[PDB]
Design an enzyme around this catalytic site. Sequence first.
Site, PDB file in Angstrom:
ATOM      1  N   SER A 142       1.396 -13.337  -7.381  1.00 25.43           N
ATOM      2  CA  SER A 142       1.542 -11.894  -7.293  1.00 25.43           C
ATOM      3  C   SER A 142       2.519 -11.534  -6.170  1.00 25.43           C
ATOM      4  CB  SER A 142       0.182 -11.233  -7.072  1.00 25.43           C
ATOM      5  OG  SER A 142      -0.360 -11.590  -5.810  1.00 25.43           O
ATOM      6  N   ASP A 159       3.797  -8.298  -3.308  1.00 26.20           N
ATOM      7  CA  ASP A 159       3.479  -7.072  -2.578  1.00 26.20           C
ATOM      8  C   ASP A 159       4.733  -6.217  -2.469  1.00 26.20           C
ATOM      9  OD1 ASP A 159       0.916  -8.201  -2.032  1.00 26.20           O
ATOM     10  OD2 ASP A 159       1.878  -9.333  -0.399  1.00 26.20           O
ATOM     11  N   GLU A 173       3.195  -4.235   7.992  1.00 29.83           N
ATOM     12  CA  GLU A 173       3.305  -4.683   6.607  1.00 29.83           C
ATOM     13  C   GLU A 173       4.760  -4.785   6.159  1.00 29.83           C
ATOM     14  OE1 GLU A 173       1.178  -5.924   4.695  1.00 29.83           O
ATOM     15  OE2 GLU A 173      -0.817  -5.266   5.360  1.00 29.83           O
ATOM     16  N   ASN A 208      -0.180  -4.730  -3.804  1.00 27.90           N
ATOM     17  CA  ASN A 208      -0.197  -6.006  -4.520  1.00 27.90           C
ATOM     18  C   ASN A 208      -0.195  -5.809  -6.036  1.00 27.90           C
ATOM     19  OD1 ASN A 208      -0.756  -8.657  -5.390  1.00 27.90           O
ATOM     20  ND2 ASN A 208      -2.139  -9.041  -3.671  1.00 27.90           N
ATOM     21  N   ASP A 211      -0.641 -16.836  -5.098  1.00 27.11           N
ATOM     22  CA  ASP A 211      -1.109 -16.835  -6.481  1.00 27.11           C
ATOM     23  C   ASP A 211      -0.066 -16.315  -7.471  1.00 27.11           C
ATOM     24  OD1 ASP A 211      -1.082 -14.135  -5.946  1.00 27.11           O
ATOM     25  OD2 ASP A 211      -3.139 -13.750  -6.604  1.00 27.11           O
ATOM     26  N   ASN A 221       3.040 -13.621  -2.956  1.00 25.31           N
ATOM     27  CA  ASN A 221       1.796 -14.259  -2.548  1.00 25.31           C
ATOM     28  C   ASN A 221       1.639 -15.617  -3.224  1.00 25.31           C
ATOM     29  OD1 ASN A 221       1.003 -11.873  -1.076  1.00 25.31           O
ATOM     30  ND2 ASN A 221       0.493 -10.971  -3.065  1.00 25.31           N
TER      31      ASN A 221
END
Length: 129
Positions: A50, A52, A35, A59, A48, A46
């Site tokens: 958002s 992380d 990750e 998120n 959309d 991301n």
Amino acid sequence: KVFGRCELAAAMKRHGLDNYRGYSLGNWVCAAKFESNFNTQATNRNTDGSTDYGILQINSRWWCNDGRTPGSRNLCNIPCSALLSSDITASVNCAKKIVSDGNGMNAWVAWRNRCKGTDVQAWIRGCRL
Ligand code: NA
């Protein structure tokens, strides 16, 4: 902070992640590796809108507030920047709520795609735990 492999394993064990909800410690180290490459300052956006955050790439769509994800939730009741600290306490405590939400560690795409079904115990081999 960029953690060493055994350093992170020891910190995750101390914070109660070893076998939490049945996931052995090697699962968490493997997830962190793919990750964030063990980097607490990692961020990724991301599609959309958002973002992380942190060593486990938590998120902002559901789990933290970064002031720029309108319409989202803050289920861990933290600012997302808290997840970038060298102290991983906030990330671990939020991760415990995620993994309990019914989907287990399948919540982490890197875990499902790169850790699940492999020998995850190899990630803690050699550590004094
Ligand atoms: Na949010």
